[PDB]
Write a protein that holds these residues in place. Structure first.
Motif, PDB file in Angstrom:
ATOM      1  N   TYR A   1      23.100 112.203  58.679  1.00 36.48           N
ATOM      2  CA  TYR A   1      23.276 112.054  57.610  1.00 36.48           C
ATOM      3  C   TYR A   1      22.768 110.803  56.302  1.00 36.48           C
ATOM      4  O   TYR A   1      23.873 110.571  56.639  1.00 36.48           O
ATOM      5  CB  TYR A   1      23.113 113.087  56.078  1.00 36.48           C
ATOM      6  CG  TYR A   1      25.231 113.023  56.473  1.00 36.48           C
ATOM      7  CD1 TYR A   1      25.660 113.477  57.422  1.00 36.48           C
ATOM      8  CD2 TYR A   1      25.208 112.829  54.914  1.00 36.48           C
ATOM      9  CE1 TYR A   1      27.207 113.092  57.209  1.00 36.48           C
ATOM     10  CE2 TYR A   1      27.035 112.785  55.489  1.00 36.48           C
ATOM     11  CZ  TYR A   1      27.498 112.701  56.295  1.00 36.48           C
ATOM     12  OH  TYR A   1      28.785 112.500  56.199  1.00 36.48           O
ATOM     13  N   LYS A   2      22.078 110.545  55.381  1.00 32.86           N
ATOM     14  CA  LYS A   2      21.647 109.622  54.594  1.00 32.86           C
ATOM     15  C   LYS A   2      23.071 109.985  53.366  1.00 32.86           C
ATOM     16  O   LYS A   2      23.836 109.878  53.369  1.00 32.86           O
ATOM     17  CB  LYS A   2      20.444 109.199  54.001  1.00 32.86           C
ATOM     18  CG  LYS A   2      20.019 108.796  55.610  1.00 32.86           C
ATOM     19  CD  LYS A   2      18.682 108.537  54.796  1.00 32.86           C
ATOM     20  CE  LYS A   2      17.771 107.167  56.376  1.00 32.86           C
ATOM     21  NZ  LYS A   2      16.366 106.583  55.434  1.00 32.86           N
ATOM     22  N   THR A   3      22.600 110.919  52.766  1.00 32.83           N
ATOM     23  CA  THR A   3      22.728 111.714  51.885  1.00 32.83           C
ATOM     24  C   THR A   3      23.339 113.652  51.738  1.00 32.83           C
ATOM     25  O   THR A   3      23.232 113.717  52.786  1.00 32.83           O
ATOM     26  CB  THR A   3      22.252 112.151  50.224  1.00 32.83           C
ATOM     27  OG1 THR A   3      21.672 111.071  50.497  1.00 32.83           O
ATOM     28  CG2 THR A   3      23.030 112.803  49.259  1.00 32.83           C
ATOM     29  N   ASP A   4      24.805 113.680  51.362  1.00 38.33           N
ATOM     30  CA  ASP A   4      25.312 115.115  51.604  1.00 38.33           C
ATOM     31  C   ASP A   4      24.550 116.115  51.253  1.00 38.33           C
ATOM     32  O   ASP A   4      24.547 117.069  51.357  1.00 38.33           O
ATOM     33  CB  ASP A   4      26.480 115.097  51.068  1.00 38.33           C
ATOM     34  CG  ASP A   4      27.760 114.045  51.238  1.00 38.33           C
ATOM     35  OD1 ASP A   4      28.843 114.921  51.937  1.00 38.33           O
ATOM     36  OD2 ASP A   4      27.564 113.736  50.805  1.00 38.33           O
TER      37      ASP A   4
ATOM     38  N   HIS B   1      21.909 119.060  52.623  1.00 39.88           N
ATOM     39  CA  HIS B   1      21.834 120.156  53.270  1.00 39.88           C
ATOM     40  C   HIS B   1      23.119 120.505  54.628  1.00 39.88           C
ATOM     41  O   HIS B   1      23.004 121.437  55.697  1.00 39.88           O
ATOM     42  CB  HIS B   1      20.614 121.320  53.723  1.00 39.88           C
ATOM     43  CG  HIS B   1      20.292 120.877  52.950  1.00 39.88           C
ATOM     44  ND1 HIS B   1      19.629 121.835  51.714  1.00 39.88           N
ATOM     45  CD2 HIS B   1      18.774 119.697  52.181  1.00 39.88           C
ATOM     46  CE1 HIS B   1      18.590 121.113  50.819  1.00 39.88           C
ATOM     47  NE2 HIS B   1      18.287 119.776  51.027  1.00 39.88           N
ATOM     48  N   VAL B   2      24.288 118.903  54.549  1.00 35.49           N
ATOM     49  CA  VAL B   2      24.948 119.343  55.554  1.00 35.49           C
ATOM     50  C   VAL B   2      25.786 120.270  56.409  1.00 35.49           C
ATOM     51  O   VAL B   2      26.150 120.474  57.137  1.00 35.49           O
ATOM     52  CB  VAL B   2      25.621 118.100  55.775  1.00 35.49           C
ATOM     53  CG1 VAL B   2      26.181 117.495  57.000  1.00 35.49           C
ATOM     54  CG2 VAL B   2      24.859 116.604  54.840  1.00 35.49           C
ATOM     55  N   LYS B   3      25.958 120.977  54.628  1.00 36.04           N
ATOM     56  CA  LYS B   3      26.421 121.672  55.108  1.00 36.04           C
ATOM     57  C   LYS B   3      26.053 122.640  55.820  1.00 36.04           C
ATOM     58  O   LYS B   3      26.033 123.398  57.493  1.00 36.04           O
ATOM     59  CB  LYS B   3      27.175 122.881  53.461  1.00 36.04           C
ATOM     60  CG  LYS B   3      28.210 123.671  53.309  1.00 36.04           C
ATOM     61  CD  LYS B   3      29.813 123.023  53.898  1.00 36.04           C
ATOM     62  CE  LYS B   3      29.540 122.080  55.002  1.00 36.04           C
ATOM     63  NZ  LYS B   3      30.880 121.888  55.282  1.00 36.04           N
TER      64      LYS B   3
ATOM     65  N   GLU C   1      25.503 123.316  59.302  1.00 35.66           N
ATOM     66  CA  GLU C   1      26.947 122.760  60.174  1.00 35.66           C
ATOM     67  C   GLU C   1      27.257 124.526  60.319  1.00 35.66           C
ATOM     68  O   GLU C   1      27.088 124.853  61.631  1.00 35.66           O
ATOM     69  CB  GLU C   1      28.005 122.210  59.677  1.00 35.66           C
ATOM     70  CG  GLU C   1      28.625 121.230  59.861  1.00 35.66           C
ATOM     71  CD  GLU C   1      29.624 120.509  59.490  1.00 35.66           C
ATOM     72  OE1 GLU C   1      29.912 120.562  58.590  1.00 35.66           O
ATOM     73  OE2 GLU C   1      30.869 120.486  60.000  1.00 35.66           O
TER      74      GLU C   1
ATOM     75  N   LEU D   1      30.111 115.237  62.025  1.00 35.50           N
ATOM     76  CA  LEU D   1      28.717 114.788  61.006  1.00 35.50           C
ATOM     77  C   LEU D   1      29.401 112.924  61.141  1.00 35.50           C
ATOM     78  O   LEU D   1      29.887 112.068  61.324  1.00 35.50           O
ATOM     79  CB  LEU D   1      29.440 115.140  59.924  1.00 35.50           C
ATOM     80  CG  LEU D   1      29.500 116.518  60.130  1.00 35.50           C
ATOM     81  CD1 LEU D   1      29.606 116.926  58.430  1.00 35.50           C
ATOM     82  CD2 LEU D   1      28.612 116.876  60.116  1.00 35.50           C
TER      83      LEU D   1
ATOM     84  N   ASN E   1      27.956 109.342  58.908  1.00 36.22           N
ATOM     85  CA  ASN E   1      27.653 109.468  57.434  1.00 36.22           C
ATOM     86  C   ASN E   1      26.086 108.071  57.901  1.00 36.22           C
ATOM     87  O   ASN E   1      25.896 107.408  57.384  1.00 36.22           O
ATOM     88  CB  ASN E   1      28.790 108.656  56.860  1.00 36.22           C
ATOM     89  CG  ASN E   1      28.461 109.149  55.318  1.00 36.22           C
ATOM     90  OD1 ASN E   1      27.831 109.453  54.559  1.00 36.22           O
ATOM     91  ND2 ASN E   1      29.545 109.047  55.158  1.00 36.22           N
TER      92      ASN E   1
ATOM     93  N   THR F   1      14.371 115.926  53.862  1.00 35.36           N
ATOM     94  CA  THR F   1      14.345 116.514  52.557  1.00 35.36           C
ATOM     95  C   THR F   1      13.368 115.580  51.467  1.00 35.36           C
ATOM     96  O   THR F   1      14.006 116.137  50.595  1.00 35.36           O
ATOM     97  CB  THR F   1      15.799 115.880  52.511  1.00 35.36           C
ATOM     98  OG1 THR F   1      15.993 114.701  51.957  1.00 35.36           O
ATOM     99  CG2 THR F   1      16.650 116.692  53.873  1.00 35.36           C
TER     100      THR F   1
END
Ligand SMILES: NC(=O)c1ccc[n+]([C@@H]2O[C@H](COP(=O)([O-])OP(=O)(O)OC[C@H]3O[C@@H](n4cnc5c(N)ncnc54)[C@H](OP(=O)(O)O)[C@@H]3O)[C@@H](O)[C@H]2O)c1
Ligand SMILES: NC(=O)c1ccc[n+]([C@@H]2O[C@H](COP(=O)([O-])OP(=O)(O)OC[C@H]3O[C@@H](n4cnc5c(N)ncnc54)[C@H](OP(=O)(O)O)[C@@H]3O)[C@@H](O)[C@H]2O)c1
Ligand SMILES: NC(=O)c1ccc[n+]([C@@H]2O[C@H](COP(=O)([O-])OP(=O)(O)OC[C@H]3O[C@@H](n4cnc5c(N)ncnc54)[C@H](OP(=O)(O)O)[C@@H]3O)[C@@H](O)[C@H]2O)c1
Ligand SMILES: NC(=O)c1ccc[n+]([C@@H]2O[C@H](COP(=O)([O-])OP(=O)(O)OC[C@H]3O[C@@H](n4cnc5c(N)ncnc54)[C@H](OP(=O)(O)O)[C@@H]3O)[C@@H](O)[C@H]2O)c1
Lengths: 249, 249, 249, 249
Positions: C7-10, C12-14, C17, C29, C31, C70
């Motif tokens: 991912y680039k930005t945080d 919907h990485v949540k 996961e 994960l 970055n 996104t």
């Protein structure tokens, strides 16, 4: 002060008629365009750009045109059903007018065109050999489906689809562009509208503003007429230009 | 009467002297352009359109330029070495002049451009977000490699390669066009050269006639200046335009 | 079975996961892209096509990639935050894979490109003389800002902005097209991807998928590599193509 | 071994007859194409690419074709009058064949097309609303003077003039492009020739290779047929392509 309201469908004619009434203007409704239109103080077009083109084919001397766009894009209109009252009021009272040149070709002496004069082949799917000259000098000879000679107002119509540039309403000029040219390289030419356009072609057909057409063979001449199309000044003409163009389709 | 002869390479400088001599014109030679050329009655440029562009970058007040096309295509030139003696005499004798507007941007206060002011990204292969405004109104915002603001004289240069229309030399205007625009639809815009152009971009570079550049971040305005490019009149400029354009390489 | 999440930005990485959780998949994960990604059963890109281009740069062998867009448009992605779940499950369970060739040029041996290899001038606002050969035969010599050699996948990137045609994902081919060509006529060439592309240019620079570049002088060759990019099979890839292209910008 | 010699004019019929006689090949003369050509070992065409197209209209099963170019550019041709005798012998002696797909329209069940199936407006200067679908998926809807569904061979014909790309002869595919599309943005589409094309439009006409046409109202489908056009293998077809395309007019 009397005005003529021209419309295609019964759309918003009722309210438009009452608005001209409150502004104490005599009204006369028209199902279709008629030369009778010259006998008014101003005209209210209800439809689209096509409506205004059809109205102008009947006018030589031209009374102020106020257009109401009933459809999607109206490069020639002043307002939509949503705000015509406000605008009409301002137009009818400030009475500031604005003019844009109209053209004519030797093949149809009594017709005037606001958008363009197009030289197309009579049969579909058939090319024609077109020779182009302006102010006497041979500027090009090319095989194509047809050739467009448009005004700056026409730059957003047929010329636009042929790949032409969009030209500002207030910059007078001719836009010479072919339709489906069969050559490795080609370019649209933008020249002064004071110049004389000559188009040479066999088994072709001339069309003006998509309304009147006549078969012809040989050579035709195209120049700036003396009877411009007249509209009420649209304060935001330039501004709206770019937005209206991006929505064409 | 005195004339400065500017040359790229000293290939014909001799013949030209022995020609301006015969015409009783004091002659001076410059290997590289200089602000001093401003102190002559007329200038003779030997080389190409580029040579003429480089000369102009040194002139605010612009003495009449007579260009001798050294190579292939020279839209700004008056003749080749094969016939300069003839055309040179007609020019010096009649001494009829012609002028084309030059423009300037706010990023480089004292530089004038005859072709265009281009705004590109600082790093190759990287896009810039460009916003455009003319006379105050927002006309467009697009991602691209760069954006060109050219005059009709520049319509056959960089603007031409970006897909711009060929515009006649005697029709003043601005051709607004992007280089490699990343968007489904896009069109070049041709507007009056009396308007004010504004380009807003970050991490960008501004270039005038391909000679003077400078980095900038933010807004820069472009508009018609008071110091035109002055050339000896070319009686066939209009007719030779279409021919020269088809041979551009 | 373990999968990498880049991912680039945080964003919907949540939830992403937590979704790979319910699917009994081990998560790691990242970055930023890492050659490490090769040691996973599959990768999940969270960002845009750019994100996927950056991931592929660090993959010789390529484990199945599943993209989540996104952004606005993602021609390489499978779903958006709004429906990645359902699509992620289907992909991971059915586990059907799809492949698209990647290219490499002599100037940069270890780099692979999915979109294109571009040859641009080192300094901006300067042309370069480009010669083009395919399979040893000379096809074209031209002056331009740069020259693109793309695959069908890159047909919607840089090549698109240069005026190239959109080629569907499943028709393997090369798209040769110049950026700002300075010539009267020019056309995009579409040749078989089995052929050897040769680009000769001085004072140029080669770029791959816009990530890696090398100044170069002389001649570079471009051809199909052996390590394709690998994504999960996207059922609507074709039908989605045309809608996604109209929204590009 | 018998061959049919089709010609448009008495041109070099004599010398071609002796050339084949001198090769122990039984010949027969045809003023205009016939369904009888299917009864020969090979066909010798004298004229241009059009001659070849008109000959293919009367052939389902296609004997090898050898083309002698009378005109200026013949992408389907094999030699000129200056050296046909030489190339003819190499052709008839090696008898190496080459095949290109022809497509068929549902409106004209028995016609075959090598260049394209074009859908145009019935009346000139009139747009038609065209809907496009390939493999049952809605790809586009646009107002235009017409729409072209060409093969790579046709990419240098009508599609070329509509602004389509140059596709090499050996890359089977369809080129979908509109003629004079009235919309801000648009792109030619290149898809696999294994897909089913569907054009939907009212008050339109379908034309095949510009020879046979019929009026239609509604939906027509286009697919790859089983009867390819056959030519003696042209060893330099790929290298001659770029040269011939640049001289089109
Ligand atoms: N692009 C093409 O393929 C093509 C083909 C034929 C004619 N035309 C143009 O249409 C005119 C003749 O029309 P027609 O009677 O055949 O049919 P219409 O008038 O039935 O068709 C023309 C379409 O173009 C719109 N239009 C007209 N003038 C325009 C302008 N200056 N800028 C932007 N859009 C404009 C019309 O107005 P809307 O808002 O009002 O409905 C309508 O959508 C010509 O002057 C020519 O410019 C274009
Ligand atoms: N098309 C492109 O990709 C591109 C890229 C950068 C700059 N340019 C143009 O070149 C200028 C900057 O010059 P430069 O120092 O980079 O290179 P040059 O001046 O080295 O290159 C410009 C080329 O364009 C020709 N040219 C110049 N002005 C022209 C005009 N008004 N119309 C038609 N052709 C013209 C020149 O002809 P002469 O020497 O040959 O006779 C020369 O061949 C700019 O004003 C811009 O218009 C074009
Ligand atoms: N059109 C141009 O002027 C231009 C200029 C330079 C580079 N590019 C392209 O950008 C890439 C280099 O990356 P970069 O770091 O310079 O920029 P980005 O990747 O910073 O910018 C590229 C933009 O193009 C989109 N994109 C990438 N690959 C695409 C594809 N195959 N089809 C359609 N759109 C695509 C990206 O989508 P997301 O928003 O989803 O990331 C992003 O908006 C190359 O693949 C090249 O083709 C285009
Ligand atoms: N660009 C246009 O505006 C346009 C309009 C109508 C038809 N066409 C094309 O011509 C064909 C119909 O022929 P027609 O009866 O109208 O007239 P022709 O056949 O009288 O005209 C077609 C012209 O195109 C050339 N040509 C034919 N097939 C070609 C190909 N595959 N690639 C490059 N050039 C090619 C012909 O070459 P020769 O002179 O050597 O025969 C001829 O000059 C169609 O298949 C279509 O591709 C193009």
């Amino acid at each position: 002060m009397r005005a003529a309201v021209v419309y295609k469908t019964d759309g918003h004619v009722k309210r438009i008629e009452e608005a001209l009434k409150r502004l104490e203007v005599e009204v006369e409704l028209f199902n279709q365009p008629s030369e009778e239109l010259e006998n008014f103080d101003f005209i209210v077009s209800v439809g689209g750009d096509g409506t205004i083109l059809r109205i102008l084919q009947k006018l030589k001397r031209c009374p102020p045109i106020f257009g109401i766009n009933t459809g999607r894009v109206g490069l020639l209109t002043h307002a939509s059903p949503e705000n015509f009252e406000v605008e009409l009021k301002k137009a009818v009272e400030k009475f500031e007018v604005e003019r844009f040149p109209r053209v004519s070709c030797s093949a149809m002496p009594d017709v005037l065109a606001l958008n363009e004069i197009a030289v197309l082949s009579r049969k579909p799917a058939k090319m024609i050999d077109v020779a182009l000259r302006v102010d006497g000098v041979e500027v090009d000879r090319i095989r194509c489906d047809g050739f467009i000679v448009a005004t700056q107002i026409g730059s957003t119509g047929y010329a636009f689809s042929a790949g032409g540039p969009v030209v500002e309403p207030y910059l007078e000029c001719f836009i010479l562009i072919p339709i489906a040219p069969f050559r490795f390289g080609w370019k649209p030419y933008v020249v002064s509208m004071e110049r004389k356009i000559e188009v040479i072609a066999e088994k072709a057909i001339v069309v003006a503003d998509g309304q009147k057409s006549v078969d012809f063979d040989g050579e035709i001449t195209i120049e700036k007429s003396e009877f411009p199309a007249v509209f009420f000044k649209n304060e935001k003409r330039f501004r709206n230009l770019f937005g209206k163009v991006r929505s064409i389709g």
